[PDB]
Amino acid sequence: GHQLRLGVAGLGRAFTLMLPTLQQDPRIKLVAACDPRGSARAQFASDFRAPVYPDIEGLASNPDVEAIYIASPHQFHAQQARIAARHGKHVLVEKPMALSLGDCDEMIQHCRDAGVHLIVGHCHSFDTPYLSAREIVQSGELGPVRMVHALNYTDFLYRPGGGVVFSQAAHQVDIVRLLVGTRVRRVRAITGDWDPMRPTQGAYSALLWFEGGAFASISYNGYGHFDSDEWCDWIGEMGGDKSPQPIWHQHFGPIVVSCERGDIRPLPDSVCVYADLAKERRSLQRPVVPRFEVIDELYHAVVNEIKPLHDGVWARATLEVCLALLDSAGSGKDVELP
Amino acid sequence: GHQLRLGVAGLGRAFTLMLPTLQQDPRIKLVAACDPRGSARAQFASDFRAPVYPDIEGLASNPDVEAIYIASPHQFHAQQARIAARHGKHVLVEKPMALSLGDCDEMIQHCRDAGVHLIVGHCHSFDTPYLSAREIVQSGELGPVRMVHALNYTDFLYRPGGGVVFSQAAHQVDIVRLLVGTRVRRVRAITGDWDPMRPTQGAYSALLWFEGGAFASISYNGYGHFDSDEWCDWIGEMGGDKSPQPIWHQHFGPIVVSCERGDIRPLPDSVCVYADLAKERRSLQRPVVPRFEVIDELYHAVVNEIKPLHDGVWARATLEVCLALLDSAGSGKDVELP
Ligand SMILES: NC(=O)c1ccc[n+]([C@@H]2O[C@H](COP(=O)([O-])OP(=O)(O)OC[C@H]3O[C@@H](n4cnc5c(N)ncnc54)[C@H](O)[C@@H]3O)[C@@H](O)[C@H]2O)c1
Ligand SMILES: NC(=O)c1ccc[n+]([C@@H]2O[C@H](COP(=O)([O-])OP(=O)(O)OC[C@H]3O[C@@H](n4cnc5c(N)ncnc54)[C@H](O)[C@@H]3O)[C@@H](O)[C@H]2O)c1
């Protein structure tokens, strides 16, 4: 309708992170949920006075549900979608889309057949400062992008096989895909794994070659020592102030975009443009609803049939990059992208 | 003597940058100079009431000169040293040492034969904060270095074959060589060249593999838009406060050193240690004499026969890395190092 009857599949962390968006946004009503855990079902049914179910089989059979936000573990993503599609439901699934490229192909096909929209869940490439930055790149005001440099140093690895590559490199790659705006053509990466305790790849650095000359360097460190939010005006990833409650925009650490005539540096509270004149802080409005840019995508895809940017085909390319990384670090070698 | 009779070959920029050190440091007396340009000679002779000369042939023949700070263009470095050595003078030559590896080999040999010290001039790897950081790594307090991430965004390219690689990547490589402390084994680099006006390689990003696992990412951008000193407590490269008074230490932009149990972040005014419990800012003393760490190296090499760290064999390895970079960017393949 005017308002959008939304069903949630998977009632954990992704869900709770997404939760204050869903309430606050006038265009969204939560109408139904599913989870295997009944205490979650008990939970949801109570707060929302709404039907709950064991499987997605339940939620997708409910005629009152217009689209399903799939917010469960990665390995269920593909199957869950294939079903929601079967029953004519729009899908918003969380990063990563899926673990495999095949999975992705199927997901996009199952959705194309059922003729329903497929969007990928809060990616940080949705955040206003970045979208605002891409606008500046779009305008051609600073000429084209030549070099992107992005870092993030977080406590993720200690927040209470790939791990950081698939969850965290995704956000990072998606922002750089967003901002450069051309295709990724080659990737070269090093992962670090140096805590026995938490024996996963906890940091990386990578080089990306882009179509038409631009290149990018991405570095992630998750071992929770240095906190890169110091260089983002002491605003946390979810918009809250960490400085030593009207939140700010979301981000994924320090990014610098170098274009021919200038440097763009998006912030949670503004976008700085370093130019031929000099410094410009063009400030941003305090987001009224957190992560509302995700809803707009969904809302306008379903109500007004507008191609969403962050569709299944986009997400698939980011994943492609994620795999290429882990292959580069995995072997000794570069990975060209066909 | 107690004091050190020093002769200067080449009286331009490097010289003037080094000049307030030379005056202020009690252990150094300027006694002689040479330059081809007589207005420079006129200049030096007047301020310092001292003998000046056309060639280094002159300065090296002066019996009163104990060592020569060679601060001329790169292509003269080798020859000038060969001579100063021939005449038994110690050499402090400016980055880069030389242009070629052969040149380097000869320089070190000419100096080993004449049995005189050879040190490479103000490298930023001399700066207190970095030396202090290496101390922390030395102590083993944080376990070994795993990943180094270093960036610098400057106005160098517009300050009134590959210019930034040899001048600027040198400082950067030297700091990372300093701090990791093991051998560089492989390099992969991308340079950008995007101003027709100033058609040089003005930016790069690189991956460095080190002996025994650690890796590093270095990024330089010289096109003078964004200023990375924002993230160094708004203190300039030569210690002056940018912001909105005795100087502070020298630096070369934001560096983060990740060791197994924590992250070290050197600053011009302190060294931050992030580890278990909290932030630690261990502060530093305001340098009494700018770049005094260069003099100590020289002074202790000549008076007290202490092996200098930044010797000709060190500088040669940095240059080796610098060449490897320009080869990687040049060919788009990796470069292993022997
Ligand atoms: N971009 C973001 O904001 C963000 C946040 C965190 C994680 N994520 C994504 O969200 C996903 C889920 O959130 P989370 O894992 O952080 O929290 P979580 O593991 O606590 O929540 C997921 C829950 O979904 C339930 N679930 C629903 N349908 C299921 C099914 N068919 N099979 C099994 N379990 C099912 C499970 O009970 C599980 O506990 C992650 O796998 C990841 O893809 C992205
Ligand atoms: N780390 C640092 O502080 C720093 C600073 C700037 C540049 N550098 C190094 O300093 C070197 C020289 O300083 P600069 O180039 O910035 O200033 P510059 O070019 O104005 O000064 C060098 C001067 O040396 C004189 N000279 C002396 N002997 C000479 C000879 N035999 N042939 C020709 N000229 C001779 C020339 O007159 C020349 O002008 C550079 O090549 C570079 O290696 C490093």
Side-chain angles (χ1 to χ4, degrees), chain B:
Chain B
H2 202 330
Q3 181 154 121
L4 192 170
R5 282 145 18 223
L6 168 69
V8 173
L11 301 162
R13 172 124 329 220
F15 165 61
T16 39
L17 277 171
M18 194 72 87
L19 191 24
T21 320
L22 305 175
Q23 272 151 334
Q24 293 173 56
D25 204 312
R27 297 156 310 166
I28 288 290
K29 202 194 208 173
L30 290 101
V31 299
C34 76
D35 200 285
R37 289 144 45 236
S39 35
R41 294 216 299 273
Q43 251 321 301
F44 183 82
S46 159
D47 315 317
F48 293 127
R49 314 183 51 239
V52 289
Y53 315 58
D55 28 23
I56 215 210
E57 199 41 36
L59 196 71
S61 298
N62 180 328
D64 221 67
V65 169
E66 275 167 332
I68 296 162
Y69 175 39
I70 292 172
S72 61
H74 347 266
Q75 55 282 6
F76 300 115
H77 282 189
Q79 174 209 351
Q80 282 191 141
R82 177 193 91 232
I83 274 125
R86 208 157 301 258
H87 278 90
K89 316 279 152 174
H90 302 298
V91 183
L92 171 69
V93 51
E94 266 280 7
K95 296 197 117 54
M97 195 164 173
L99 265 346
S100 146
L101 280 184
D103 265 28
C104 273
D105 294 316
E106 269 205 272
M107 274 157 84
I108 312 144
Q109 185 76 47
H110 282 317
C111 275
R112 234 130 222 190
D113 298 340
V116 281
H117 289 277
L118 174 41
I119 306 171
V120 165
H122 175 258
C123 187
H124 273 285
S125 39
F126 275 80
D127 303 317
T128 290
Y130 299 110
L131 289 184
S132 179
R134 174 193 191 252
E135 216 100 44
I136 290 174
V137 173
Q138 286 327 286
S139 94
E141 167 187 16
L142 289 184
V145 171
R146 306 313 273 148
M147 153 184 184
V148 181
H149 175 85
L151 67 99
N152 201 17
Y153 277 76
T154 63
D155 87 318
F156 167 86
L157 250 250
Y158 306 97
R159 270 175 206 156
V164 301
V165 202
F166 270 102
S167 154
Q168 301 285 273
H171 290 303
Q172 258 204 346
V173 162
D174 222 280
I175 297 165
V176 169
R177 282 185 63 249
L178 185 96
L179 286 171
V180 176
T182 100
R183 253 190 42 89
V184 165
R185 293 302 327 266
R186 189 166 295 98
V187 172
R188 184 57 181 272
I190 302 177
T191 63
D193 172 30
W194 67 71
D195 177 37
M197 230 157 54
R198 325 318 246 61
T200 203
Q201 289 138 312
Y204 59 91
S205 295
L207 288 175
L208 308 189
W209 285 257
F210 279 85
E211 210 130 87
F215 64 90
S217 154
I218 52 157
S219 312
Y220 187 86
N221 191 311
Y223 287 102
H225 291 123
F226 171 67
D227 169 53
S228 84
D229 291 347
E230 195 197 318
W231 296 336
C232 292
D233 292 350
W234 275 114
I235 289 149
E237 171 184 343
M238 311 303 166
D241 211 325
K242 331 201 72 162
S243 84
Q245 143 286 187
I247 62 134
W248 264 120
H249 290 284
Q250 321 221 312
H251 71 87
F252 207 57
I255 328 287
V256 163
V257 193
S258 297
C259 311
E260 279 159 40
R261 319 188 270 189
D263 288 324
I264 318 153
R265 156 157 183 254
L267 288 156
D269 65 347
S270 54
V271 170
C272 291
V273 190
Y274 308 95
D276 291 287
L277 209 57
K279 182 171 294 255
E280 199 179 326
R281 170 178 295 249
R282 318 179 166 162
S283 89
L284 293 169
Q285 261 313 281
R286 347 200 37 112
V288 194
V289 214
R291 298 182 167 180
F292 69 96
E293 332 87 0
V294 193
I295 302 316
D296 290 359
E297 269 203 46
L298 183 60
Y299 190 82
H300 285 127
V302 173
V303 166
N304 305 128
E305 253 297 325
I306 328 276
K307 187 60 164 211
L309 194 159
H310 276 106
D311 71 341
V313 147
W314 176 276
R316 186 205 189 266
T318 289
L319 178 92
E320 215 202 11
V321 170
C322 287
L323 289 151
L325 289 193
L326 272 156
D327 280 330
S328 199
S331 60
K333 309 174 204 104
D334 292 7
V335 178
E336 322 207 50
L337 264 86

Side-chain angles (χ1 to χ4, degrees), chain A:
Chain A
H2 202 343
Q3 181 153 121
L4 170 47
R5 282 145 18 223
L6 168 69
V8 172
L11 303 160
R13 177 63 94 253
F15 167 60
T16 12
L17 278 172
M18 194 74 86
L19 194 21
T21 319
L22 305 175
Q23 272 150 336
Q24 292 175 57
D25 204 312
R27 297 155 311 165
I28 287 289
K29 202 194 195 168
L30 291 101
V31 300
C34 78
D35 199 284
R37 287 143 47 237
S39 31
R41 295 216 297 273
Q43 252 321 302
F44 183 83
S46 163
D47 316 316
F48 291 130
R49 314 175 58 234
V52 289
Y53 314 59
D55 28 22
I56 216 215
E57 201 40 37
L59 196 70
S61 298
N62 179 328
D64 221 72
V65 168
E66 271 171 331
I68 295 162
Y69 175 42
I70 294 173
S72 62
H74 347 262
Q75 54 282 10
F76 299 114
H77 280 190
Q79 169 223 342
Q80 281 191 140
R82 176 198 87 233
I83 275 128
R86 206 156 308 260
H87 278 89
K89 316 281 152 171
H90 302 297
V91 183
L92 169 70
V93 51
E94 269 281 5
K95 300 198 113 53
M97 194 162 173
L99 347 108
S100 150
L101 278 187
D103 267 27
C104 277
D105 294 316
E106 271 206 272
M107 273 158 83
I108 312 144
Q109 188 73 46
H110 283 317
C111 273
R112 233 123 224 193
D113 297 341
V116 282
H117 290 276
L118 174 41
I119 314 176
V120 158
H122 176 256
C123 187
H124 274 286
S125 39
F126 274 80
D127 301 317
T128 290
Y130 300 111
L131 291 183
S132 182
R134 169 193 202 255
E135 287 175 62
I136 289 173
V137 174
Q138 286 326 288
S139 92
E141 171 193 11
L142 289 183
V145 170
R146 307 313 275 147
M147 155 186 189
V148 181
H149 177 84
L151 68 100
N152 202 17
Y153 277 75
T154 61
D155 88 318
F156 169 84
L157 250 248
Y158 305 99
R159 271 183 211 142
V164 300
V165 200
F166 275 101
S167 155
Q168 299 286 271
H171 290 303
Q172 257 204 347
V173 163
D174 221 281
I175 297 164
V176 167
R177 281 185 66 246
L178 184 96
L179 285 172
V180 178
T182 101
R183 195 167 71 101
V184 164
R185 293 302 324 255
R186 188 165 323 141
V187 173
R188 184 58 183 271
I190 300 174
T191 63
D193 171 31
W194 64 72
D195 177 37
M197 230 130 301
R198 324 319 245 61
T200 209
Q201 289 135 311
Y204 59 92
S205 295
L207 291 180
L208 310 178
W209 283 258
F210 279 86
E211 213 135 82
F215 63 90
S217 154
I218 51 156
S219 312
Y220 188 86
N221 191 308
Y223 288 101
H225 291 123
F226 173 66
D227 168 53
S228 84
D229 291 347
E230 193 193 314
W231 297 336
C232 290
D233 296 359
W234 276 114
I235 288 150
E237 176 181 332
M238 317 298 166
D241 209 332
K242 318 194 57 163
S243 91
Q245 332 295 138
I247 62 132
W248 263 120
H249 290 285
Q250 321 221 313
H251 70 88
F252 207 58
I255 327 287
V256 164
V257 195
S258 293
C259 310
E260 278 161 41
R261 281 182 268 143
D263 286 326
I264 321 155
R265 154 160 186 253
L267 287 159
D269 63 348
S270 53
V271 171
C272 292
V273 186
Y274 306 97
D276 282 327
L277 243 162
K279 175 270 313 269
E280 202 174 327
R281 170 177 296 250
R282 317 184 170 153
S283 89
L284 291 170
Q285 254 291 295
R286 345 201 38 112
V288 204
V289 210
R291 299 181 165 181
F292 68 95
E293 334 86 359
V294 197
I295 301 316
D296 290 358
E297 266 202 48
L298 182 60
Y299 191 82
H300 285 124
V302 171
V303 165
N304 306 125
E305 255 294 326
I306 298 157
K307 199 56 184 290
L309 195 163
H310 276 106
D311 72 340
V313 149
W314 177 274
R316 185 208 189 265
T318 289
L319 180 91
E320 212 199 15
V321 169
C322 287
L323 290 152
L325 290 191
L326 275 157
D327 281 329
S328 198
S331 63
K333 312 213 86 189
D334 294 359
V335 179
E336 255 162 326
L337 264 86

